[PDB]
Amino acid sequence: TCPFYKKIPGTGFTVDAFQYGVVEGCTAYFLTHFHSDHYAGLSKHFTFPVYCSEITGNLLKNKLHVQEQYIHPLPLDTECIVNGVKVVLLDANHCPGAVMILFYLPNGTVILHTGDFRADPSMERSLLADQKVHMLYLDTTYCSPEYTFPSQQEVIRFAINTAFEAVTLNPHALVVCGTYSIGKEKVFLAIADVLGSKVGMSQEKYKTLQCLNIPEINSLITTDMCSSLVHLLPMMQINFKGLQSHLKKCGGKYNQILAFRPTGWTHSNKFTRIADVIPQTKGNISIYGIPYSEHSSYLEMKRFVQWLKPQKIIPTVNVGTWKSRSTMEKYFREWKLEAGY
C-alpha cells in the first residue's frame, strides 16, 4: 500500500506513487522526474490526472504513451492553482525535467517535497526564501558523512581533458559513454563539443533526448554512428566482452576505445581524489569510472537543511531498514543543535 511518505496531508495529492493501483482519495498524482523507480506503474492505460514539468510530460507522452488529456504540465517558478491548492515547481538540479514541489495548504502549512535533488546555494535565493516551510520531504540518498564528492564542473573538466588528449594523440580512438536513464548528459555533450563531434546513439536513446528542450539539440546528437566519434552505449554493455564486440562492429574504423562510466559514489571516493583516478585496461580498450553525481553530497544536503530550518523532516530514500532510519534521525538532530532552529 502507498507509503505515508508519498502522501501530502490535507490534499488529494500523492508524489511519485504510481505502483499501488488506485490510491483511495487521490485526485492528482504528481511526478517529480522521469526515473523508473519514481514512475513505476504508468502506462498508456492511466486515466487520472498527472501533474509534472513540461519535459517530464514530453517523456510520458512519447516514451510511455500516456494520453495528452491526462498529462498536465506546469511551468517552473510560477504560482499555479491545482484543484484549489496553490503549488510551485522549482528546478531540482537532478536530471532533465526534475522538479521540487512547494505546496501551500489552505490551513497555512507550507510543504516542500524535493523529489530527487542536488542541493545548491542558488536555491537559497529562489521562491523558497520568501516564507517559512514547515515540513520537508527529503532526498536522503547520500545522508552519511563519508559521501563527499567533487563539483560537477570539476568532474566535467577532467573528462574534457582526458578525452581531448587521447584523441589528439590517436585520431583513430573512440570515446564511448555509458548511460541507462536520462541524467548526466553534460558528461557526453561536453566531450563531443571539445572533440568537434555529434554524439551517436541508438534510435530509442535519440528518442529520449529529443524530448528534453535542450537548445540546438539537432546540432549535437545523431543516429548515424559511423559519422561520429563519441558514442553512447548501454551501461550493461560497458565492459571488455561488450566493448571488444562493439569495437568489432564499427568495421576497422577505430583502433582504441576510451570509455567513461559516470557513477554517483563508489568506495574509492574515500581514498583517492579526482585528479588521480585510473582505468582498467584489457588491450586497446580503457574504461574510466567517474563520480558524476546528480544527488546532494552530505555537506550539500546539510547546508541546505540548516538554511531551510524546517519544523519536520521526512526522508524518502533509505527508509527500508530501522538502522538507516535511526542513523538519519541522529544526523538531523546534530544539524538542528549546531544551528539553533
93 vs 269, beta carbon nearer Ni ion = 93
Choice between 185 and 195, CB closer to Ni ion: 185
For Ni ion, what does the binding mask look like between residues 192 and 211, x meaning CB under 5 A? --------------------
Q: Does 35 bind Ni ion (CB under 5 A)?
A: yes
In 10 A of CB 64, how many CB atoms? 14
When the beta carbons of 35 and 246 are compared against Ni ion, the nearer one is: 35
Q: Kindly tell me which residue out of 116, 139, 185, 300 binds Ni ion, with binding defined by CB under 5 A.
A: 116
Residue with cell string 546528437: 221
Under 8 Å between Cβ of 197 and 229:
yes
Q: Considering only 81-89, 113-121, 132-140, 298-306, which stretch makes contact with Ni ion by CB under 5 A?
A: 113-121
Nearer to Ni ion, 198 or 205 (CB): 205
Total interface residues for Ni ion by CB under 5 A: 2
Burial classification of residue 24, based on how many CB atoms lie within 10 Å of its CB (0-12 exposed, 13-18 middle, 19 or more buried): exposed
Going by C-beta distance under 8 Å and a sequence separation of 6 or more, which residues neighbour residue 212? Answer: 55, 58, 96, 97, 182, 185
Contact window for Ni ion (CB under 5 A) among 33-41, 47-55, 238-246, 281-289: 33-41
| Residue 69 per-residue DSSP state | G
When the beta carbons of 116 and 185 are compared against Ni ion, the nearer one is 116
> Cβ 71 to Ni ion, closest distance in Å?
20
Q: Nearest-CA neighbor of 277 among 178, 194, 155, 192? A: 155
Do 63 and 204 meet the contact criterion of CB atoms below 8 Å apart?
A: no
- Rounded least distance, CB 212 to Ni ion, Å: 15
**What is the closest distance, in whole angstroms, from the C-beta atom of residue 223 to Ni ion in the complex?**
26
DSSP secondary-structure letter at 339? H
> Would strands 85-91 and 80-82 be described as parallel, antiparallel, or unpaired?
antiparallel
In the chain, the amino acid numbered 96 is P
Judge contact between 285 and 259, C-beta under 8 A.
yes
Cα 83 to Cα 81: distance, rounded to the nearest angstrom: 6
Binding mask 4-23 for Ni ion (x = CB under 5 A): --------------------
Residues 63-82 that bind Ni ion (CB under 5 A): none
Stretch that binds Ni ion, among 28-36, 170-178, 279-287, 299-307 (CB under 5 A): 28-36
- Least Å distance between CB 117 and Ni ion? 9
* Interface residues toward Ni ion, by CB under 5 A: 35, 116
